[PDB]
Coordinates of C-alpha atoms and ligand atoms in Angstrom, one line a residue:
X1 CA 0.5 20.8 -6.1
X2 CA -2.3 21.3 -8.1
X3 CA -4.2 17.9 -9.6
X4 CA -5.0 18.1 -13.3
X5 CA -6.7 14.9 -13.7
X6 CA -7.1 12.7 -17.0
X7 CA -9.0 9.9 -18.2
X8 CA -7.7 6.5 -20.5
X9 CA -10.9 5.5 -21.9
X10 CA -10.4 2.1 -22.9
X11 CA -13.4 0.3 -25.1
X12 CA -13.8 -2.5 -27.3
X13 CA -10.0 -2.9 -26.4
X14 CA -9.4 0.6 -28.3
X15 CA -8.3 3.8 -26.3
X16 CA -10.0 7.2 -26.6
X17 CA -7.8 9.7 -27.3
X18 CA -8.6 13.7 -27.7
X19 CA -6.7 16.3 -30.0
X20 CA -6.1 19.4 -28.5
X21 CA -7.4 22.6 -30.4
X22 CA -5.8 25.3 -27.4
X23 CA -3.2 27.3 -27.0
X24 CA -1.2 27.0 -30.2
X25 CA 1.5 25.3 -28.2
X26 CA -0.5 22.0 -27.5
X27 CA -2.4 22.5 -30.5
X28 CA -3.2 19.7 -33.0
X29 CA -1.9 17.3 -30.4
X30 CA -2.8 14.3 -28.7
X31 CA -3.9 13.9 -25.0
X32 CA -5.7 11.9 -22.7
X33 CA -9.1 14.4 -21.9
X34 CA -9.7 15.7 -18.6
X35 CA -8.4 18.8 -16.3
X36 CA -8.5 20.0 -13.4
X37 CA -9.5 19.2 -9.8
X38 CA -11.4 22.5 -8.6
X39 CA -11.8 23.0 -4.9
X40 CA -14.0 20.4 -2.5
X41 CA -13.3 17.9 -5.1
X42 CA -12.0 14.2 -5.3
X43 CA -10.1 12.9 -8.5
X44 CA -12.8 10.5 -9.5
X45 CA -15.4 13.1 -8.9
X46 CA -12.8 15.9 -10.7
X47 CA -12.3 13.5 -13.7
X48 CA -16.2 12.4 -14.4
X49 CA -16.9 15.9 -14.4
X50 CA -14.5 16.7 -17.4
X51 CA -15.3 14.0 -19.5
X52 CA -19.3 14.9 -18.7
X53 CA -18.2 18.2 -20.1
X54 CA -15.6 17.9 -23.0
X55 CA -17.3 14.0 -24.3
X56 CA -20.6 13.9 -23.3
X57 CA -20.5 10.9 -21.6
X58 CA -20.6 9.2 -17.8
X59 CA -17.6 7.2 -17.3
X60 CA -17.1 4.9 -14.1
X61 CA -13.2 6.2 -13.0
X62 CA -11.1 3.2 -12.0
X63 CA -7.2 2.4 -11.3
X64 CA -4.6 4.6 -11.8
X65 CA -2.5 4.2 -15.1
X66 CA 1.3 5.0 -15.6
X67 CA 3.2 7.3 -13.3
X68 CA 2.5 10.5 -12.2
X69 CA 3.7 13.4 -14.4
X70 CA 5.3 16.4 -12.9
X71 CA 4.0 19.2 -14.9
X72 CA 5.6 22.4 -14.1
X73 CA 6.0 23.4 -10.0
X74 CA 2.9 24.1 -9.4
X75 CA 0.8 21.4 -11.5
X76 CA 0.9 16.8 -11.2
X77 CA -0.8 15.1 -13.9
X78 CA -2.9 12.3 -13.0
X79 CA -4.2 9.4 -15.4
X80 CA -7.1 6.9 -14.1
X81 CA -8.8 4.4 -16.4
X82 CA -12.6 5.1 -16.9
X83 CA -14.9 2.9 -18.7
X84 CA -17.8 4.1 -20.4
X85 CA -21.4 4.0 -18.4
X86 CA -23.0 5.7 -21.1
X87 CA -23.0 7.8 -24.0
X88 CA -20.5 8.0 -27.4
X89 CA -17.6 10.9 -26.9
X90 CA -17.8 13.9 -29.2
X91 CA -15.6 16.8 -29.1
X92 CA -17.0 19.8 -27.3
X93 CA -13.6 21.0 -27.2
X94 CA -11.4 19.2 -29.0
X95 CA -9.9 19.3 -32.4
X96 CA -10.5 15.8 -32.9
X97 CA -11.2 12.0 -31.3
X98 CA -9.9 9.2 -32.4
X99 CA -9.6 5.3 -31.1
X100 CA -6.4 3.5 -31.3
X101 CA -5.1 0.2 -31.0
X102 CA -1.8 -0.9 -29.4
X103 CA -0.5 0.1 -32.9
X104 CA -1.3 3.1 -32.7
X105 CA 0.3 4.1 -29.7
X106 CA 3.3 4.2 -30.0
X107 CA 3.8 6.5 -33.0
X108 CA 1.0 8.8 -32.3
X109 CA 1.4 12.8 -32.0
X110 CA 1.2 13.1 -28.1
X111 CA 1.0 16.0 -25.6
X112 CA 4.5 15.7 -24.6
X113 CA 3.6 15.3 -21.3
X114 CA 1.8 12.2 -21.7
X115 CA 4.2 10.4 -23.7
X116 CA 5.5 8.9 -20.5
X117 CA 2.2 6.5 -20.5
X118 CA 2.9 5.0 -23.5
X119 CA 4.0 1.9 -22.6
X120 CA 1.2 1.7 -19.7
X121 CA -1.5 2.4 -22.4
X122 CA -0.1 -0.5 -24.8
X123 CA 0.0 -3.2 -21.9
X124 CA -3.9 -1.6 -20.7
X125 CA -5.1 -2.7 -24.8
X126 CA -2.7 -5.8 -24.4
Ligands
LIG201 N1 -3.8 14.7 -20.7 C1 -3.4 16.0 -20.4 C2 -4.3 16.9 -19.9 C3 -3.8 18.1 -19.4 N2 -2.4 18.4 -19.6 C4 -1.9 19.7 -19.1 O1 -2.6 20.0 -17.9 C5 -2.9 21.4 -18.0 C6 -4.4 21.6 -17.6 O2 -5.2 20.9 -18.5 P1 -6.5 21.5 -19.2 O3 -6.0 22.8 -19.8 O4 -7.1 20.4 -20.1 O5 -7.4 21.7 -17.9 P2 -8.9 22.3 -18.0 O6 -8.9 23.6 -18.8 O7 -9.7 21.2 -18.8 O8 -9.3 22.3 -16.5 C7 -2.7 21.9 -19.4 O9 -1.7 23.0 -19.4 C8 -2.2 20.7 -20.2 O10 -1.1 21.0 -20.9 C9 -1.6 17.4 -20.1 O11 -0.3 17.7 -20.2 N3 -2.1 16.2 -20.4

């Protein structure tokens, strides 16, 4: 399969997450940033690129978080932590960032496919 890779920014015990502005399907929805692995390269390597791109800032790419998500049958969706080296995010290609607490979580308007990590981004902020 092809790696699409994504990032659970975690700062000042808040999470970064990213609103989707394409297509219209995912539009105005919520997702962990990132995308994906192009030839030659590794998932850390993959993930710091995207979130260079899309936030502007150089993240340090850590553990893995929650499962893998099988996307379609070509496509696995991959979440690492990352903490921030440097920088403060802004949208490049986003709709919208926003940090949530624990609260927050839960009740937010998510990607669908990322809805599985729920639980594993309220223990992360727990
Ligand atoms: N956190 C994310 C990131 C991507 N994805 C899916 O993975 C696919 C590739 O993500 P993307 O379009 O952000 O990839 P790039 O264009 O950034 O390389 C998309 O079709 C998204 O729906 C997801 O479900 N959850």
């Amino acid at each position: 399969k092809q790696i699409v890779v994504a990032g659970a920014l975690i700062s000042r015990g808040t999470l970064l997450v990213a609103q989707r502005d394409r297509p219209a399907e995912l539009a105005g929805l919520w997702e962990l940033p990132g995308g994906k692995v192009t030839p030659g390269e590794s998932d850390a390597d993959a993930l710091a690129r995207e979130l260079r791109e899309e936030l502007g800032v150089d993240v340090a790419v850590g553990e893995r978080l929650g499962a893998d998500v099988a996307l379609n049958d070509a496509m696995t969706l991959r979440a690492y932590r990352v903490t921030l080296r440097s920088g403060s995010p802004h949208p490049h290609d986003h709709r919208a960032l926003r940090w949530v607490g624990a609260d927050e979580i839960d009740g937010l308007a998510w990607v669908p496919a990322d809805r599985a990590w729920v639980p594993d981004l309220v223990a992360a902020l727990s």
